[PDB]
Amino acid sequence: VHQVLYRALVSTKWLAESVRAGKVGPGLRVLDASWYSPGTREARKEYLERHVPGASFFDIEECRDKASPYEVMLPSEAGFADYVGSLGISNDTHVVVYNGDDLGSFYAPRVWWMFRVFGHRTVSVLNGGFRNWLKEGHPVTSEPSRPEPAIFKATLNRSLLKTYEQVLENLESKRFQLVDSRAQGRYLGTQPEPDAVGLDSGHIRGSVNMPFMDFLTENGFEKSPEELRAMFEAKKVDLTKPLIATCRKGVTACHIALAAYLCGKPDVAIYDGSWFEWFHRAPPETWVSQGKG
């Protein structure tokens, strides 16, 4: 049971203006959750090299159950809190996270919802990213941020998350809308999955393509409420009934929720594992592609 939606999109000027104010504190907290592939770019290095005044880095690699056989999962209730709190974040601080990839969004959402799952209201994303931050030409730094650690109480919410048992009960149920931001080539089964061995490209019977790229503009700014609600319907996708989304590692999925979230439906959960768990966990016969199969 939900009601009033919280502000999930922040602007360059807003935080910028909140900086000079020195509002940044146990109150408001901005972090940079950005991650590009092996060889591509080293963000760890990039952040400490150039980042938002009083921002902290968010290691997507150490904010997860480094125990699971599979790519990036939601830590334990105890795990999370200790991290978030590790970097002076309380249950009352608003959280502004983001990535710095040309797009503007990709891994941000990943983290955004994350916070959402652990029942935490105040948590909005940055419309424009570091892309437009540095384009807008706003202050930056190469100075350590060492907040005064705090206590973050975490309570996992079963609504925003559906596991591989439910997702499988659905394939037969036929009551939960299944989206996948994996992207057409991936979704379609035409393009192979980077950084894999014996991994097969394809999709889950019922899967409808809704690439996360289409949800953002070339300017690297999010589309509007209007357009968002038209692309969805354009694809005979109803945001009125329960919805669930996949992708590769359930990162770009949360993009569909910021998407749905903004059209007025926090309700949308996520099959965290994505097509990765599926392909491995589940019988072939319940996932389809073209190239072989």
Side-chain angles (χ1 to χ4, degrees):
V1 239
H2 70 78
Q3 21 226 341
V4 165
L5 289 186
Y6 186 70
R7 230 142 55 78
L9 238 54
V10 171
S11 97
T12 42
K13 188 195 193 112
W14 203 101
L15 216 311
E17 182 187 74
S18 274
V19 150
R20 316 192 317 262
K23 268 210 192 163
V24 125
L28 159 95
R29 301 294 213 206
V30 155
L31 7 113
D32 147 44
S34 47
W35 185 97
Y36 319 109
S37 310
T40 288
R41 330 160 44 165
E42 36 232 19
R44 174 65 215 269
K45 156 119 196 214
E46 289 206 333
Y47 145 91
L48 71 106
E49 242 188 339
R50 206 219 337 203
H51 61 66
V52 159
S56 300
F57 177 59
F58 183 110
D59 226 342
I60 106 116
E61 295 260 305
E62 216 86 30
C63 216
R64 49 144 186 141
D65 161 9
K66 358 191 293 133
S68 165
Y70 323 107
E71 309 175 340
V72 200
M73 330 278 314
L74 264 165
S76 88
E77 286 207 306
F80 196 78
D82 261 2
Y83 184 111
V84 151
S86 191
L87 70 117
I89 284 179
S90 245
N91 290 94
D92 282 63
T93 101
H94 171 202
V95 177
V96 169
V97 44
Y98 68 44
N99 36 242
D101 108 318
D102 299 309
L103 256 253
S105 235
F106 186 118
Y107 254 98
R110 187 346 128 135
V111 164
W112 163 74
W113 163 86
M114 263 198 87
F115 255 109
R116 290 196 76 224
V117 212
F118 295 118
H120 189 70
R121 256 325 245 5
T122 68
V123 56
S124 12
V125 187
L126 188 78
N127 201 31
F130 212 44
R131 143 138 174 185
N132 268 266
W133 181 248
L134 191 92
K135 176 168 185 102
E136 242 132 333
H138 290 123
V140 285
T141 9
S142 65
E143 273 171 5
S145 358
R146 247 109 280 236
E148 214 60 281
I151 226 59
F152 185 89
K153 217 197 154 158
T155 314
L156 183 109
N157 175 344
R158 287 244 173 203
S159 282
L160 264 355
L161 204 147
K162 297 261 155 278
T163 66
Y164 153 104
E165 326 289 332
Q166 337 201 254
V167 133
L168 203 90
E169 239 177 359
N170 190 59
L171 206 126
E172 261 303 310
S173 269
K174 255 181 167 201
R175 78 150 143 177
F176 255 101
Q177 232 146 216
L178 208 71
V179 186
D180 222 297
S181 46
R182 240 214 274 187
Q184 239 203 24
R186 300 296 265 317
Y187 168 86
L188 278 197
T190 276
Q191 282 268 312
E193 292 291 328
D195 320 329
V197 144
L199 165 43
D200 247 340
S201 85
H203 58 271
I204 305 166
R205 292 178 93 202
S207 288
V208 179
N209 236 159
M210 261 217 112
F212 83 71
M213 299 112 136
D214 288 332
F215 282 108
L216 244 114
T217 88
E218 72 178 1
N219 257 7
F221 274 103
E222 195 76 1
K223 288 259 245 299
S224 17
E226 299 140 318
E227 325 191 73
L228 298 160
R229 173 193 168 153
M231 298 162 46
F232 280 140
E233 98 174 28
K235 255 121 143 170
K236 229 127 227 216
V237 165
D238 199 0
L239 70 142
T240 290
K241 330 154 105 163
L243 193 145
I244 306 178
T246 20
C247 65
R248 232 275 180 146
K249 351 146 149 149
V251 170
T252 77
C254 329
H255 240 105
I256 269 134
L258 222 208
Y261 187 104
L262 342 159
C263 286
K265 203 203 194 196
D267 290 308
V268 177
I270 263 95
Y271 171 33
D272 193 47
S274 287
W275 159 275
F276 204 79
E277 212 178 3
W278 206 245
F279 180 84
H280 279 92
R281 265 230 156 124
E285 286 89 48
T286 71
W287 72 244
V288 359
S289 122
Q290 162 116 284
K292 257 188 166 161

